Design a protein around this ligand. Structure first.
Ligand SMILES: COc1ccc(C(=O)NO)cc1NC(=O)c1cccc2c1oc1ccccc12
Ligand SMILES: [K+]
Ligand SMILES: [K+]
Ligand SMILES: [Zn+2]
Length: 399
């Protein structure tokens, strides 16, 4: 079955942040308005037996002192008094400032995403679900002891850690507009978790990594050498060119790695209508949405898959995309046609989809060959280092 993470308190917490507001409510209510919820298995967020057990789970990646600081930041923001100078310095030492500010629910908000993605991994591990969706997760920038890019706790790293510890190999695919640096870093030294981010990169663009570093392309270290893959793309790319750019890479990674699990971050900020206005992807499902192309390809592998959210700052259009991803996942996994009306159905958030109230977003639509050569060589290097068996020419012919 296809699972999806939600719940009443989960929804409230996922809607409690200043940056993402009620986006999660729009997403889930649009899925509900399209009558998809009866087709999906509800996966409840993980809850713990004690504070100690919760800390044990979160500090499988994050440092104790960072988790302590994140909890204190929440406590301080539930009081009226300003922070002391010492507490400002403490928060600064963990980058709990600027684009990762405090707010009254910052710890509960960030922990909720972890609860959802851990429960999603568990539902895959016990084979209750073949795919699980968590549109409240995907916070790929958070580091062991540092908040980054409004990511406070890295739910992805923790879910992947649960999957590998369940030989197990995980393929991580990051479709967000931004480089998946936190996940890449967490598994930099591990050959068992292969990470692949496609993203925009350019001078001064956040977070700065996932591209040439004379410049060299770093790709992992130690026994994780060659295990971190990146495809940086110039601005303006459309559905077809993005699809042709990542399609052969995805198929090649699946053939060589033969993953036990796939984890996909599906940040919606590549949409042409995202306020970043960098890429020109759509949610169209006949030009075919690059997102839907990638998800369909990944699901064709019949590997247990975790699908996560991430960025996406046009909330109605993020809901438009992720509703289409959710329907596609049902169709591909269950073989059951999901007919989705081109008009937004009436529901509590209907007014957010004006003026036209349609499901399609409102949009009128060499370098990559060099990257393909580089990535194919890295994959050969990864397979050689890890003594993996594979037909080099069947993979080469994909490109
Ligand atoms: C450092 O920035 C990021 C780092 C990481 C990510 C990300 O998605 N990671 O995967 C995103 C940004 N910046 C923005 O989200 C942003 C970008 C443009 C406009 C807005 C933005 O937020 C807004 C909130 C309210 C109103 C407007 C906006
Ligand atoms: K990405
Ligand atoms: K790795
Ligand atoms: Zn992003």
């Amino acid at each position: 079955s296809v699972g999806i993470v939600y719940g009443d308190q989960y929804r409230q917490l996922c809607c409690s942040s200043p940056k993402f507001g009620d986006r999660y409510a729009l997403v889930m209510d649009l899925i509900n308005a399209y009558k998809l919820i009866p087709e999906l298995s509800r996966v409840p967020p993980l809850q713990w037996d004690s504070p100690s057990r919760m800390y044990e789970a979160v500090t499988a990646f994050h440092s104790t002192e960072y988790v302590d600081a994140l909890k204190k930041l929440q406590m301080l923001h539930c009081e009226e008094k300003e922070l002391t100078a010492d507490d400002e310095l403490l928060m600064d030492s963990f980058s709990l400032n600027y684009d990762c500010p405090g707010f009254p629910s910052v710890f509960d908000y960030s922990l909720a995403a972890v609860q959802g993605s851990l429960a999603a991994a568990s539902a895959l591990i016990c084979r209750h679900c073949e795919v699980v969706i968590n549109w409240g997760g995907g916070w790929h920038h958070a580091k062991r002891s540092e908040a980054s890019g409004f990511c406070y706790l890295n739910d992805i790293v923790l879910a992947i850690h649960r999957l590998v510890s369940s030989q197990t190999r995980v393929l991580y695919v990051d479709l967000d507009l931004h480089h998946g640096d936190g996940v890449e870093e967490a598994f930099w030294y591990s050959p068992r978790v292969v990470t692949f981010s496609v993203h925009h990169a350019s001078p001064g663009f956040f977070p700065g990594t996932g591209t040439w570093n004379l410049p060299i392309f770093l790709n992992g270290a130690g026994r994780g050498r060659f295990s971190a893959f990146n495809l940086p793309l110039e601005e303006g790319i459309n559905d077809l060119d993005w699809s042709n750019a990542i399609g052969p890479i995805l198929d090649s990674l699946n053939i060589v790695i033969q993953p036990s699990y796939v984890v996909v971050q599906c940040g919606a900020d590549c949409l042409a209508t995202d306020p970043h206005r960098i890429f020109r992807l759509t949610n169209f499902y006949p030009s075919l949405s690059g997102y839907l192309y990638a998800i369909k390809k990944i699901l064709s592998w019949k590997v247990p898959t975790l699908i996560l959210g991430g960025g996406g700052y046009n909330f109605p259009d993020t809901a438009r995309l992720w509703t289409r991803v959710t329907a596609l996942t049902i169709e591909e996994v269950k073989g059951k046609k999901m007919t989705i009306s081109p008009e937004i159905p009436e529901h509590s958030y209907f007014s957010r989809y004006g003026p036209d109230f349609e499901l399609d977003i409102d949009y009128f639509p060499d370098s990559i060959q060099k990257h393909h050569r580089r990535i194919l060589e890295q994959l050969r290097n990864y397979a050689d280092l890890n003594k993996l068996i594979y037909d080099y020419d069947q993979v080469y012919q994909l490109y």
